[PDB]
Chain A
Amino acid sequence: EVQLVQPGVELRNPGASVKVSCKASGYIFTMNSIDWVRQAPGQGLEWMGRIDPEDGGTKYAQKFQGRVTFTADTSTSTAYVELNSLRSEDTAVYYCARVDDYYLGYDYWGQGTQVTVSSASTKGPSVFPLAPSGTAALGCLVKDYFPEPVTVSWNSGALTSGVHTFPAVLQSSGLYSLSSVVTVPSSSLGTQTYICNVNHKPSNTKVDKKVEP
């Protein structure tokens, strides 16, 4: 239907400035104001401010006034958030939500754009199969990567039932490691082909590992 497409993630060093974007597929601009809500890890939602795309009318919650800026371009139907003097505190998920004019907000929301404030270098992952040996379990090991996240899909997204993509863990190396599994019937092992698609946009890595018995 209507889609508020934001990027998946950006990593900046401390003091550098980011620009969270939000493409509004739709539906269509305008006559739908836009606001920015942020979600720090495990903590609730925090209201940052609004925008009138009609003609860039803005409001900021005191605590965001001075460090944030919301721009909007009527041409590409894209709205922005520019946070300055980035601190490790600013590490959160930045939401682009569409404000309905009566009953306030937020019928359609955006995917989230995790922002990581870190001095560390990008690193692509290493994809290894987890081989099966009347329900068998097979998987993928997405080892040694930075930063989070990685998107793991099975059979180009066609396989969804019983898929378990585990929460990533921090190794002693400071690199994340993840594992994605799927329970399948033992009968389909000879018939069906199982291939995990692994994506890591920060390092521009795209792997398709075929899991064999």
Chain B
Amino acid sequence: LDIVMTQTPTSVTASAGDKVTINCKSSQSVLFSSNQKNYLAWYQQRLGQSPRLLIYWASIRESGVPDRFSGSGSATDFTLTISNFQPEDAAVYYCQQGYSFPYSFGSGTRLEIRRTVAAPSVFIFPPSDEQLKSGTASVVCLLNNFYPREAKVQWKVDNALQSGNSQESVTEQDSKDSTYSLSSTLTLSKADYEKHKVYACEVTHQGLSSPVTKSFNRG
């Protein structure tokens, strides 16, 4: 044999409050005839975290799990249902069988969230005096609490656009307000940094009517 777990859909996006549904179908019945118990469990995994058990016995809720989360179905077809979908519920959801060996999980299902367009609060940081000691200069640009994920950053050293010396990283969606945060870092050798006065960061997001620019003078 070897039961197979099939999750539907692969990814979902819904507004705060709308009813969310995840389906999981097994290749073989996970219901045990004598105890009339379905061997199915639902889990919620977040980034940089261990999975968290929500539903067991296909319809039983775990202690401390919100009422909105509900387990349903029998034999092969199972369904996890979030009623008042909240920002906290933006995570990966897995279905797991326990009826036979080897144990099988689902492919996972990514739930997402829609929010009002939020403009980024822009911040600029010059390199620290100790970083300088050793012939390097890293300039950091901060794009705090913004939605959608799509945004543009442009470095302008003495009003001359920079290319191929910067790197950016984005955070996962926030559990509370459901926004993003971006960090761009401009890295130059001490000699190149010491050459110029002005250092500008130009941000282009749909939450901003005009491109916001944060700058500084070296010393």
Contact = CB atoms under 8 A, between A and B. Distances in A.
A183 B98 contact: no
B131 A45 contact: no
B106 interface: yes
Nearest to B131: A128
Given A45-B105, A164-B171, A130 B140 contact: yes
A106 B51 contact: yes
B106 A104 contact: no
Interface string B52-71: 11001100101000000000
Interface stretch (B19-27, B122-130, B192-200): B122-130
B98 A179 contact: no
A126 B171 contact: no
A131 B128 contact: yes
Given A167-B171, A169-B169, A103 B50 contact: no
A86 interface: no
A166 interface: yes
Contact of B50 (A104, A112, A135, A169): A112
Nearest to A106: B53
B191 to A, nearest CB: 18
B125 A131 contact: yes
A167 B169 contact: yes
Contacts of A171: 167
B167 A179 contact: no
A103 B128 contact: no
Interface size classification for chain B: 35 or more
Nearest to B5: A44
B123 A137 contact: yes
B169 A128 contact: no
B85 interface: no
A179 B183 contact: yes
Interface in B47-103: 50-53, 56-57, 60, 62, 94, 96-99, 101-103
A179 B50 contact: no
Interface in B154-198: 167, 169-171, 181, 183, 185
Contact of A44 (B107, B170, B185): B107
B213 interface: no
Contact of A164 (B94, B103, B140, B181): B181
Interface string A111-135: 1100000000000001011110101
Contacts of B97: 104
A137 B144 contact: yes
Contacts of B29: none
Interface string B96-121: 11110111111110000000000001
Contacts of B144: 137, 164, 181, 183
Interface of A: 35, 37, 44-47, 49, 59, 61-62, 95, 97, 100, 102-107, 109-112, 126, 128-131, 133, 135, 137, 139, 141, 143, 164, 166-169, 171, 177, 179, 181, 183
21 contacts: A44-B94, A44-B106, A45-B51, A45-B105, A47-B105, A103-B37, A104-B99, A105-B53, A106-B41, A109-B51, A111-B50, A126-B131, A128-B131, A130-B128, A130-B140, A131-B125, A135-B121, A137-B121, A179-B169, A181-B142, A181-B183
